[PDB]
Amino acid sequence: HAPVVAARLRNIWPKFPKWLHEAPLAVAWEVTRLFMHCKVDLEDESLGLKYDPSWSTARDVTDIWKTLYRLDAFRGKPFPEKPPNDVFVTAMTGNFESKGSAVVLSAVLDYNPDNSPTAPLYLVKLKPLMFEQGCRLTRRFGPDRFFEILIPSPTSTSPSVPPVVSKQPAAVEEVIQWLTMGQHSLVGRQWRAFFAKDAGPKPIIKERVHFFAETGITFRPDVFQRTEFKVSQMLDWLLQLDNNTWQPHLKLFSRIQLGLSKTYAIMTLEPHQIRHHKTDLLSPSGTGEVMNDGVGRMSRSVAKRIRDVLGLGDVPSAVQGRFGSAKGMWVIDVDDTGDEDWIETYPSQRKWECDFVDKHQRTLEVRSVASELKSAGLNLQLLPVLEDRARDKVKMRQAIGDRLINDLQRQFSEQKHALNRPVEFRQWVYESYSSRATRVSHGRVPFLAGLPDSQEETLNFLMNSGFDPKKQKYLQDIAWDLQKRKCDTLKSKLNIRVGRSAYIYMIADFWGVLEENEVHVGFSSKFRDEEESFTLLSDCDVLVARSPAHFPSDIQRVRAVFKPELHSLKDVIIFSTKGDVPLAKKLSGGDYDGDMAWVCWDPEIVDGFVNAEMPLEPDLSRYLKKDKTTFKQLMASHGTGSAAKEQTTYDMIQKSFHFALQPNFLGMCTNYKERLCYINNSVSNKPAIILSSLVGNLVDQSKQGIVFNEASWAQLRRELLGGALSLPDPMYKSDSWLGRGEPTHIIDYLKFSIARPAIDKELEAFHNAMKAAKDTEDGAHFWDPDLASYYTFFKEISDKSRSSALLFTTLKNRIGEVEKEYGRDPYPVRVNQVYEKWCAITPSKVIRLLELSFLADREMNTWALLRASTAFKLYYHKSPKFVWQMAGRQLAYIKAQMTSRPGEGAPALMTAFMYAGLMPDKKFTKQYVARLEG
Amino acid sequence: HAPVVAARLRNIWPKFPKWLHEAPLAVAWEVTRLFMHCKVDLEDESLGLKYDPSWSTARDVTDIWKTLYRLDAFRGKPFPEKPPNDVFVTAMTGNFESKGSAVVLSAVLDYNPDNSPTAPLYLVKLKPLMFEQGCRLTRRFGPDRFFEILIPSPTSTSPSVPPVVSKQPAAVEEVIQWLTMGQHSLVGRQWRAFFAKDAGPKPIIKERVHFFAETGITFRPDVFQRTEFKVSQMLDWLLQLDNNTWQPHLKLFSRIQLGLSKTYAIMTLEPHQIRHHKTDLLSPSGTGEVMNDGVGRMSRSVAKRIRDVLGLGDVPSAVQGRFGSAKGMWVIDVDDTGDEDWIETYPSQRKWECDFVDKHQRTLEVRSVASELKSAGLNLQLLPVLEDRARDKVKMRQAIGDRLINDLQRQFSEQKHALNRPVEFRQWVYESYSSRATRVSHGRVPFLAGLPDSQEETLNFLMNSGFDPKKQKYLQDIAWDLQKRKCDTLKSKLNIRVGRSAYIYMIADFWGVLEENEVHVGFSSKFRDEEESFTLLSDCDVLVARSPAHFPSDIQRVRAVFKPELHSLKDVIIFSTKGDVPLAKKLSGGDYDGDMAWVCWDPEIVDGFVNAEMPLEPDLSRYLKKDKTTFKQLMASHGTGSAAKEQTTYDMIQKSFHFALQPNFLGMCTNYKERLCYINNSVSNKPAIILSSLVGNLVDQSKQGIVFNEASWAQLRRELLGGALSLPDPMYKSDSWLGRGEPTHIIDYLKFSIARPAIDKELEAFHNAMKAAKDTEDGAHFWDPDLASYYTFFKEISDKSRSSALLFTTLKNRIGEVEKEYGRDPYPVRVNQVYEKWCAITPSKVIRLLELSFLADREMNTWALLRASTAFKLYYHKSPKFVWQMAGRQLAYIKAQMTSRPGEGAPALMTAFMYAGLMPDKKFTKQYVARLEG
Ligand SMILES: [Mg+2]
Ligand SMILES: [Mg+2]
């Protein structure tokens, strides 16, 4: 209770008018969207609203907008963005649920640029209805009963946040109280907050908040659409709270995310088909250490059902999933020769005490599946630890630089060789970038004016009509804008490719075949590495790590040993369940609940590596303070019974919001550690081990109820390190070397001594080169007599003219006016405006032939060809970008017309749709060139 | 010495004129080709020949033919076929050798249709110069010194052979004597025969004969281009005869093929890098049985050199090859951790005693490499043995029929579902047939008149311009001509697909890890089988066989056991070197010199199979007679010394020709066995075991010097079987069931009770269907108002006309005349003649716009569009095939023009070349449809 805030926080939501009370939910939503967008008051008695019965039977939102919109006070504009028909129909007539898809109600709030109280504080914009995969909670209660917002974080220091908030300390408490203390009215429902989390110049970070429709003017009571139902009951259904009062309430709150997790429901197992283990697999040595933390077995038939329902090409050996209170990985049991469905759970997987009675508690839900692997490369964060652990560091670093030089050299040589032939450049362009998703989405290649959106797509579009990148300059210009942008990217991550490396899901050996420092890795298909290929790993040492590696021991060298017993388990890496300490825990305190290991079998990287043992970690208890207050202790303030428990549930939501919305130090302490280790150039000295242990403990902050605030951070740096004082940014944060002398920090050296010279050297190759291009024959020109084809044709006619002649003159004149327009708001919109003036350049018996009006698409007439060529003749000079951008499309037609030769095959006129479905045939390219070259 | 033959056999070769003696070899060859083809005498003094100096510097044969040809008496015609430039240049200026390629001199002889002696007997036609991969012998002596012919077999009974030959018993001896006894003059060289072999209504089979240029008017003596050199010396170089006189001379002659084998030379190994073993790996049990017959190890570096020189994507684990006298397989040694080059040979691989001194004796030559595997299916010849060996035969046969029904059902359902959408039908059409090699060869899709050659290519060409197979009838007609032809093929091999089967090179276990009935099979990549995938085989039983399987024991069930020690050996199957008898020898007396096993791991096929032991084979020595006469015994007729040895060599050639040219009984006895086993319906009774043993012994007939003639065949059937008497053909040789009642012989049953009903039932589905197609809207029509577009445009103009009008009338008239021409010699030539009359239908200011003469390709003008549409309007009726075949190409353009819509993307005009390089993108199709279907 500030109050300042309020009154601000009025009144934040759009009102729900009486004329609109006959809904339905989806109409209410999408109509409210047209009103807010057009800036139209929904409680206006000047507009004569109303309610179109027709909206009730609507199958396209555009019908409930053209209403409307009409009225005159709606124009505007057009838009809102608009929900897709199939989505809208589902929301209208399919229960907000289409197979696995939920219809999602969402909004984004931004601070009100306005001011004074009693202005809102937040502006709300309602997103269009959309599909997203459902989750346990939307399958149980209905997708239409869930609402989510993105909202500016109330503890966001700073500086672009309203004064009104935070120069008024706690009302951070007022914002949360607004969020959580009562119901929010939106589109005729009563929404209550039950979850908050982080989101999926310098902007204000937003937090995602989830609301549940507890009631609304369509619901009905109760005990004992659509029935009234409280958040406390919903969460009790999810978490079986009676049996989980022993839990730290912040940790219990964090489990709510497991009901919100977007998942694929696979199948519901019968109780007799479920095996709950009372104990985990423990260390053979008696350490009591859990050896299979987060991982269990499933039958083979269960995995086949997953292939089936998900439509996988193959039975997956392991999946990341949920099952009642259980969360983690399940791996096929290699000993399963039956055909009966079963799954097991282990204590380490079960996040609350669950009776597993209702079918939703016994449904296997899949988050992700073990899939075919792809090369991982080396991330620069692994490098300091790899260098630290090197038997010989000078050689390691010479080798890594040589590797970067070679790979770069290698990619340049392939680009420049491919550039020498249209079939080959097309193949190279196609391979350089995937356009399939864009093509699938549009049912064609999208165009901006007369050319594809995409530079890559523009190159191939033009080459497919016969242009040559070594002959035409525009093609040339784009080809190298592309190579430039790619150089920029390389100098900005140090993701050195290591062909023999991959990120692989970690699984534990239930079957007792792997000795302690042995791992089993078999692949589902051929893993290729330039000259060599692998279907599995055997008799070699490998490096394993989890990102990020902080401790010297966070990367381990072990032996890859293929066990025939585990042959069927593919695209996972199996760790031993022997020894004192699971291998997973050595990899940055990891486990088997979805962790993936960086696995490296590259000999040069593996062979110089020496294992370090686990660090003696410091006691950080003075700084890291765990709130261990249980749900039972919170309930003691209210008493006993149902009302006591209900209020305790809401207490937990409010106290946990107050915890979730505190600043994140993980990021801050990680950056300090980056900076400190950089200046020290050490990841293994005492300060380094302290900060790595620190950030390690902050990862589980939320479910450990660790309180760590500013005073404690300062105290900890005061007492154990620095340098309150900002540490300087590493030099590698800058674009150029701003250091003194030669780089010393392996990253500085790789970016500044190695990468930067090599890049600039590789770019001096074809600016050289540019430059090397008058009448060698070769080279590359804007001129192409083929494209002045129709120009010269009609000038001849034109001669001769009488009055064609006059038509031809108007044409040249108008083109001139439009090039002037091109000379002079976002970019695509301005280009369109000019394109539209361009297309507006329009013409017995000669005009009829040029116009071909029986064609619905103007831009396919002979006139368009003539207009394009005339513009080319007049402006290839002069304004090359103008002509190509407007008329690229018809220049291409003309080129394909002109280069055609009798008896040398037929040019193909492809529809936009059918063209989008073809790709370059790499075998054709390869075989055709091979025959060209003798 | 008949003589009858001669004089016939004159004078068989084209003469070599004096005016042509200044060569060069290639000019002589190709000029002689123009003369023989045009029917022009090369010893003509009426023509004023001559010799163009310009021919000497020629780089295109067309230059030495347009000479010429000229003259007037050369027209004619055009052709000969013509050698490719790169080939001609190599022959002219590159020594007949281009890298690995030899330029080949070849001719085909056919019996002279003429008659009387002194007519030739044979007509000779000289093939155009061509590239073929070289061989040991052409690398050693030069490709230009080798000549090969195809020649009618002189023992070819019958009946279309000249009376003159064989109704004159032995002159089979006169033909061979002509071939072998002396030199043959051809294009100024003296050719001597050194090898003969079988070739690579009912025609007369030809035999391939090889000649060596021993001298010619350009050569020079000798001892001690291009030097004189005898065949006896050449063969002595090849076979090191001094050390091989112990060999049966027919067997020694058969080794000549090893110098002729087309191969890739890889690398030459130093003597210290070669390991010759004195003994093979022998049976552990003391049987003395060779356990690695034909197989040896090579180092890893040797295999990498093979990947290198051959340009393989991967190091091959094994190769089929030659190396001095050694022939067989070499497999990488898994124990090789060095990087030194080495190879070994074993006695079983070495086919003569070789000192391995010259570099050509120490060069590894590769015939083929172990490559990625593909599904094999079940051939019908395996079936009788599989049925014989079935634990339960009634169930086996029920199962096999069900499988055939299901697979058929399955392929029909996929075809008919794909047919429902142009993107999907295109994808299905593309997958149904590979056109890439044709496309690579032409640098485009070849057209016949207005459409692609290929029906499949025609469908996609038309769909890519917007036609729909469910809407247009012509597209429909072709789509189903295609499905018909494919049904015809299925009813005509019983190649029942078994997804889990492959043909795999057999290798022996040098490393002692496989127990006797264990095999090791790992694949180089994912082997897919519908719902399941394999990178290797482990813990299952498998069937192994070599085709053909005759004995009940020729198929064996064994255990697939993956050995980690052999993990690196991929796409080969390793057999144990333990036990009494190598597994290879049990598979139809096979071995490890290139044999491939049918490997089957399909559970349903494997599980009912019971192994039989080796048959007690009969003694066939009375019928099968081995000529064991050695080279030493032949030399005893001439004496001792160099002249004696030389004449003995020629004796061996002549006696061995006389042996090679005897009738082949393998084929005849195999067919008798087919027929006998069919009537008996048994492959395991005594007659069956006798005939299988018979054909087994006849396989090695040539190098075993087994004499087996007609009298002995008759004697053997008289004494051990039948039925001299022809046995009837199996019923399955006929197209319809001509048997009595239900088929009893599993093949009769599968073809007649199962396949034939199912096929006819699956074809009654879409003739039904045809038929189900007036104005449901749907269905499929010839009419398309889009294609009458230009017709209606110009009729309107035309109106209105004055005199366009007159132009339009001539146009319709001419089209009419050309459709009449289409109504009325090979097919493609006649179509062209009409196409040419079609293209000849040709037109101030209106004609100029229709004609667009600045376009080099007429068929891209607006006139062509108008002509095509007018013809369509007039004739879609009437003659649908006429219009589409002539104007398909412009109908497509019009369709793509007409269906284009503003703001729905741009049609693409692709060049013929660039169009040939694209393929349907299966991921696009799949993803696009998935979004279409919600
Ligand atoms: Mg984890
Ligand atoms: Mg063999």
Residue numbers in the entry:
A (entry chain A), B (entry chain A): 390 to 589, 604 to 627, 641 to 1240, 1252 to 1270, 1282 to 1372
What's in the article?
We report the 2.3-Å resolution crystal structure of QDE-1, a cRdRP from Neurospora crassa, and find that it forms a relatively compact dimeric molecule, each subunit of which comprises several domains with, at its core, a catalytic apparatus and protein fold strikingly similar to the catalytic core of the DNA-dependent RNA polymerases responsible for transcription. A cell-encoded RNA-dependent RNA polymerase (cRdRP) is also involved, in plants, fungi, protozoa, and certain animals, but apparently not insects and vertebrates, producing dsRNA triggers and hence amplifying the PTGS response. Overall, QDE-1 exists as a compact, but flexible, dimeric enzyme with metal binding sites confirming positions of the catalytic sites but with extensive additional structure whose biological functions are less immediately clear.
In space group C2, the dimer is formed by two subunits related by exact crystallographic 2-fold symmetry. In the lower resolution C2 crystal form, the molecule forms a symmetric dimer. Here, the subunits both assume a partially closed conformation (the head is rotated by 4° relative to A and 8° to B, and the slab is displaced upwards and outwards by 4° relative to A and 2° to B).
